[PDB]
């Protein structure tokens, strides 16, 4: 949260905190309305930026958030792990039963596919790979490789 | 239309011989999945009202019919190994009991919900 003065350079209006900087931004005790994150604390600072009009004083605040993992665990990491474990369980079936193993493997790939599509509904459209993207890619690769192993057998 | 056709499609398992175990089993369970996918869109249109309307009632009855068809086949296959002559009449009973029950429900439903 960066604020400062419009129209008034560093030689005309400077800002300062009224109390000790560690005691200026006071967050209310119940003032954490975050369903997903965890407000750890505040961190204030002061600086001088340079724009086209001159040098300005800029008062910065930083609110430190830490995401909650339990929901993503229960939603994506346990179902994907269970699906991959199911793929490995398909190895223990008998080899003379082709249709059973076939439907098992391919329906498991389809299950992974639906889980992957629903898992990407929450992530914003970022242009790189997240940690869940790597986990999902490796799980999908493992399911596909188990099906390829069955094909080889 | 789609739920009704899904129910009359799940009824197809009855005419199939009892020895086609994977055929009837996959048929029943896949029509179950189809019934769930249809049940979603019925309530997608409405708010989170805490009571039973007429369309969710219809789709729940259709899902119950599909579920009951699959469980009926399950019990029939279980009784095949124990009493064959007993299981020989279950299919002939279901073939008449499921369509007539669905038609009776359709009649009472479309009559009670239009007299209002």
């Amino acid at each position: 949260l960066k604020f400062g003065s419009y129209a008034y350079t560093r030689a005309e209006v400077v800002y300062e905190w009224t109390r000790e900087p560690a005691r200026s931004v006071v967050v209310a005790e119940d003032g954490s309305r975050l369903n997903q994150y965890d407000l750890l604390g505040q961190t204030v600072d002061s600086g001088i930026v340079q724009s086209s009009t001159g040098e300005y004083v800029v008062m910065t605040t930083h609110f430190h958030l830490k995401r909650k993992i339990g929901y993503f665990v229960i939603q994506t990491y346990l179902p994907c792990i269970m699906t991959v474990i199911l793929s490995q369980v398909s190895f223990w079936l008998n080899r003379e039963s082709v249709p059973a193993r076939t439907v098992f493997g391919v329906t498991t790939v389809l299950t992974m596919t639906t889980l992957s599509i629903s898992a990407r509904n929450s992530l914003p459209k970022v242009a790189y790979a997240t940690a869940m993207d790597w986990f999902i890619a490796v799980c999908y690769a493992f399911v596909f490789s188990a099906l390829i192993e069955f094909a080889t057998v | 239309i789609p739920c009704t056709l899904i129910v009359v499609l799940s009824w197809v398992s009855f005419w199939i011989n009892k020895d086609a175990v994977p055929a009837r089993t996959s048929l029943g369970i896949t029509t179950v999945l189809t019934m769930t996918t249809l049940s979603t869109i019925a309530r997608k249109s409405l708010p989170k009202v805490s009571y039973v309307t007429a369309m969710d009632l219809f789709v729940s009855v259709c899902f119950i019919f599909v579920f009951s068809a699959l469980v009926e086949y399950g019990t029939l296959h279980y009784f095949v190994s124990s009493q064959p002559a007993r299981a020989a009449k279950m299919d002939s009973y279901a073939r008449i009991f499921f369509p007539t029950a669905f038609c009776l429900f359709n009649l009472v439903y479309w009559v009670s919900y239009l007299y209002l």
């Binding site: 000790e20 900087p21 560690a22 204030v44 600072d45 | -």
Partner: protein, 105 residues
């Protein structure tokens, strides 16, 4: 409480060159560390406020460099009146000062 470890405790360097002092904080003190130069039998005089901001009356040979934890004070081309104690003190919380650093020829 935030403590400031100032290095080195004692340092001897001749006249004419560029010397450096370091000061590390334990917690976060964001560009809120000031540098004072205290001569013997005198009061401490502020040299650098903020993190890198020369005060009114100090020559341009003193320069500061600031961070979240560790800060530096460089005196380029030291002189014969720049030999005194140097204190770094954080203001982000209730002020605490470093152990100080002596400067001898």
């Amino acid at each position: 409480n935030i403590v400031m470890t100032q290095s080195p405790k004692s340092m001897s360097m001749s006249v004419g060159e560029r010397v450096t002092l370091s000061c590390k904080a334990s917690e976060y003190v964001g560009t809120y560390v000031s540098w004072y130069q205290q001569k013997p039998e005198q009061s401490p005089k502020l040299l650098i406020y903020g993190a890198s901001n020369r005060y009114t009356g100090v020559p341009d040979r003193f320069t500061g460099s600031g961070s979240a934890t560790d800060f530096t004070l460089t005196i380029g081309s030291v002189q014969a009146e720049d030999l005194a104690d140097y204190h770094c003190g954080q203001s982000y919380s209730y002020p605490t000062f470093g152990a100080g650093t002596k400067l001898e020829l």
